[PDB]
Ligand binder design. Structure first.
Ligand SMILES: CC(C)COc1cccc(-c2nc3cc(C(=N)N)c(F)cc3[nH]2)c1O
Lengths: 13, 245
């Protein structure tokens, strides 16, 4: 599935 | 940032470093910004107002140092530069000081997620933390008002939100501060944002998420008593933001 979906705002770890 | 600690981008993966090119060969730092979505970075209109030539700006993501490369950094050009119609500056304050930069890499893509590149969350309409909340600010700004150079290592510090009633006291900023701004200071006026920090993020936990609560905008001096740092209140520009993002 496409990379963009892997951002989770505010998540550092 | 006056005070604070030196940090790395893994601790602020949404921080964006904006530079300007002078074909004389040099690239100089302009301001900080924050990644909202893969293709959009938000900063301050006053960072561009004077040289609105989008082609001369370079945006880097995943950068822990100012003029040396960080492994994993990404470089982008500015595809669109949206400044706020109604931005205004006076003797201190900047009004509607928010800007959006749409980014594109030389391969034609937007940012990709990594351990050093992440988006930060936006607040919901007019929703803010309550004064007292400790939030953090990050940037490459001055470490002392008398400095004429910026640090090479990224810094961060924690500051607390104060109420408008306190900030609008005549011996602070009076009416220079509006409802579209937020003030944040250190209880002991020991750490603060400073020149070079403009456009970067004021991050607070809101409803369980680390949210972009403010954008570093202006202030009288740096880490001065009764002179809090002032930030654009992002919760009040959500329609504007959506109109373009
Ligand atoms: C890049 C150019 C537009 C230059 O922009 C600037 C020129 C001169 C001063 C600033 C500036 N002063 C600032 C002062 C403060 C503060 N809390 N004391 C701040 F947070 C950001 C600032 N940014 C600034 O952002």
């Amino acid at each position: 599935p496409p990379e963009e979906l892997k951002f989770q705002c505010g998540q550092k770890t | 940032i006056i005070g604070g600690e030196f940090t790395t981008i893994e601790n602020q993966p949404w921080f964006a470093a904006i530079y300007r090119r002078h074909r004389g060969g040099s690239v100089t730092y302009v301001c900080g910004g924050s990644l909202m979505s893969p293709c959009w970075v938000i900063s301050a209109t006053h960072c561009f107002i004077d040289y609105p030539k989008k082609e001369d700006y370079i945006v880097y993501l995943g950068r822990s140092r100012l003029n040396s490369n960080t492994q994993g950094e990404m470089k982008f050009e500015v595809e669109n530069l949206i400044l706020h119609k109604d931005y205004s500056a006076d003797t201190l304050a900047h009004h509607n000081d928010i800007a959006l930069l749409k980014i594109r890499s030389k391969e034609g893509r937007c940012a990709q997620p990594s351990r050093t590149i992440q988006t930060i969350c936006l607040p919901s309409m007019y929703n803010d933390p309550q004064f007292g909340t400790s939030c953090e600010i990050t940037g490459f700004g001055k470490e002392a008002s008398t400095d004429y150079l910026y640090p090479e290592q990224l810094k961060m510090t924690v500051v607390k939100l104060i109420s408008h009633r306190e900030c609008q006291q005549p011996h602070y900023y009076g009416s220079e501060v509006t409802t579209k701004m937020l003030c944040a200071a250190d209880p002991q006026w020991k750490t603060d944002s400073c020149q070079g920090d403009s456009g970067g993020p004021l991050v607070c936990s809101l409803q369980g998420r680390m949210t972009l609560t403010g954008i570093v905008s202006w202030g009288r001096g740096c880490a001065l008593k009764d002179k809090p740092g002032v930030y654009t209140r992002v919760s009040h520009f959500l329609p504007w933001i959506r109109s373009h993002t």
